[PDB]
Design a protein around this ligand. Structure first.
Ligand SMILES: Cn1cncc1/C=C1\CCN=C1c1cccnc1
Ligand SMILES: Cn1cncc1/C=C1\CCN=C1c1cccnc1
Ligand SMILES: Cn1cncc1/C=C1\CCN=C1c1cccnc1
Ligand SMILES: Cn1cncc1/C=C1\CCN=C1c1cccnc1
Ligand SMILES: Cn1cncc1/C=C1\CCN=C1c1cccnc1
Lengths: 199, 199, 198, 195, 192
């Protein structure tokens, strides 16, 4: 049934179409687990970090009966709709470090969690402070407003490399909504706050 | 129904044909919102900047009925005709940092606004004074002259990063039309004047 | 059967997007790293840049043919094949693959893929100047298939005379790990590269 | 109709087939910037417009009651396999890779390119200047299949650390040891100096 | 000439080694060194530019000699999967990726390549200089499938000078029972 399931997903799902249920927004969960902090610059206020970007959402049309079938499959993301998330204050392309496969569950829920390396512009002052710096990253949909996509956040140092020259103090995630000057609509995002200190 | 709207587009879009409309030029709007200034060099006169390149134009073929269907949708740009804009004094290709989706309205109006990192050759003198420097970026079509394509420009620190170590004194944008030595036709560009200084 | 015939059949039966499980059991991937070079280390940042042959074998019994009177093996580009989704967990760059992306398929269905790879890691570089030397640990495991669908197991001679470093020992350990977020276990091979400066 | 002209092109251009009587290719470089110079390694980094023209009569159409010119993606056209022999990086193409096609089958491709070369940089701080020679030619076509013909500080950047004294172009034929066919190249000479 | 490309597209099998009978494909390789660009005697690494002349025969491509040759995209043809074992970067190919095809089936591919190698740089400044050896061979075809058999274009603006030899070698590795043929290129050069 596993090739069957991939087949059913590809015949049934269009990657270029938002899986909106009954003209409700598509609820996406976003969550970052930091793995490393590689380059910090206090003169230019730029940081280099590696993290797992956990992204989950639902496409109920994908679902299948798993009484005698596998409960899950791994699928190339090029066969799915994936939300067009962006980090607003990113100053580089995000470098994907892991195979780009999503996990689909028989109920129609999807998990995509690449490990990503990326550079951001953010407040770095206090890095050499026992209070540490707090760097804020904002992530949301680039071209879908809140009527279509809604972004909700789900040991902060649990998988953090210990060989990093930095140490994490806390990670906190909060939901925001913003309307920009060019356009009438609002865009939901998550601000992740990364509190870290040099060692 | 968002799916039915998109198939229609995929069927009739013609990515390689200017939606020219009866030998009148396509009227393109171009507008930059500077987001960050990352590096500057007074001796080489080079600049590294991140900006939103907002681009709008009409494709009539793309229109549909929004009465019982949605007003607009996100489309991959690989599925559309896109203006062949180039920045004349660019010295790198643009690194596109965001998903390459454009917004298409049922009236055929297309919005495409990517965050872009690029490096330019321009006048950096003054960057360390209070008066600041004035760097000019020129954007036009590369292969469509005045009759085929027209570009028109349409708060300057509204989206600028507060963690940048530069700041914007003013942004101004004026239209222009130039004939080159090689060929008789004229080309339109938008001239953008970034007046900024080191904080 | 000729080489063309074998490739034709592989293209007819291969399904690059779908794991080739035998009934119930997990695909048993084998992995061993053969280190060729250690190019840049940083004692301050704890980052290494290494070159290695990633020898990877596994079985896809659907590909099999009778080779009594035909070739026993062919080379196939990996896009024609299902390949395991292995990741180095503590890598901080993509793998630069240096060799032609070709796999070797045996008539019984065994597959061998062994790319030469240059990659950068985040590991312990302390003591690289010491007699004890440094011990960098590289962790490799399936990224999206848990232990019931993929298992990985471990299977200095070709290390460059010209590197600025010498190898002391290379050991491997198997781990199985369930993570905070998700209910499954994921297997990996931990390789320990014990090296020091000449 | 402009759509109609492209449709015709797609089913009329064999991108893999040269259209021949050697194809006559015109090459000229208009320099936009000199970005780096390294007097010790003899390396230069430059930005230039590559004007490339050639005829593809197979592509022609009727100009009356018809648009005289269209913009076409080069991926859909044959294009000369030009290469710079003293290049030491791949060309970064800074512009959209579209050609323009006239109704009489004349073709224009003029990308903006950044590229690094190995050439003589001695004298760049001299009043006389330095003279950097770039040689361009077809890589796999000999004289009987392709000839290259060559057709100023005019578009050169005011903000460059350097200025152009003179640009000159010559034609050459060369036979290499490996193969007995002849290859034509246009040698472009750049006399420039630090201001 | 359009017809020849049509046939080649028609009969050419890019993924299938074109072995005749039971014998291996004879691949000729030779490097023409054009430029040595960087050198690091500390790390023993070099960055060079060379032309790689690679030639071999594929008879599924032949035509009744119409002109003798045509230029083809290598994407249209089987190409030998040579790799340089002591490479530490991917090849950066600087020329159009086009192969010349003779009517008899001879194929010639010669790109200009820029690559960094790991080799012996010790003494490059010395009168003796250093000597880098670049080993080149098929990565996944053993000696029964592929056999590999082996200075006037150097740039005068290079900061380096060349005092070049080529040798055949055949290697059986610990993992596997077959032998892999290679060519070792030996290059003695010093700082100018
Ligand atoms: C700045 N920003 C944050 N999240 C999304 C955006 C981009 C905007 C703001 C409004 N218009 C859009 C848009 C619409 C269509 C295509 N691309 C961007
Ligand atoms: C320099 N420039 C500014 N805007 C567009 C250009 C490019 C030029 C100048 C005129 N001829 C063209 C051309 C013609 C055909 C194909 N590509 C470019
Ligand atoms: C950290 N790690 C090691 N091996 C795999 C992972 C990633 C995780 C573990 C939890 N679930 C996954 C997953 C599942 C589906 C898609 N992507 C990631
Ligand atoms: C050095 N050069 C200048 N123009 C062409 C060349 C390359 C050579 C030398 C002769 N024949 C070739 C060739 C033939 C087929 C494919 N690639 C290169
Ligand atoms: C190390 N080396 C030198 N020349 C070729 C090689 C690669 C080898 C050695 C034996 N087995 C392989 C192989 C076989 C199939 C696919 N990939 C690699």
């Amino acid at each position: 049934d596993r090739a069957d399931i991939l087949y059913n997903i590809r015949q049934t799902s269009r990657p270029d179409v938002i899986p909106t249920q009954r003209d409700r927004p598509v609820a996406v969960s976003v969550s970052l687990k930091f793995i490393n902090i590689l380059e910090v610059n206090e003169i230019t206020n730029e940081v280099d970090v590696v993290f797992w970007q956990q992204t989950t959402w639902s496409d109920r049309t994908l679902a299948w009966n798993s009484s005698h079938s596998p409960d899950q499959v791994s699928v190339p993301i090029s066969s799915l709709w994936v939300p067009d998330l962006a980090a607003y204050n990113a100053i580089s392309k995000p470098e994907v470090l892991t195979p780009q496969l999503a996990r689909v569950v028989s109920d129609g829920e999807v998990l995509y969690m690449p490990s990503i390396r990326q550079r951001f512009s953010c407040d770095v002052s206090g890095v050499d402070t026992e209070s540490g710096a707090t760097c804020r990253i904002k992530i949301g949909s680039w071209t879908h407003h809140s009527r279509e996509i809604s972004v909700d956040p789900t040991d902060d140092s649990e998988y953090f490399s210990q060989y990093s020259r930095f140490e994490i103090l806390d990670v906190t995630q909060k939901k925001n909504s913003v309307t920009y000057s060019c356009c009438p609509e609002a865009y939901e995002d998550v601000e992740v706050s990364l509190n870290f200190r040099k060692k």
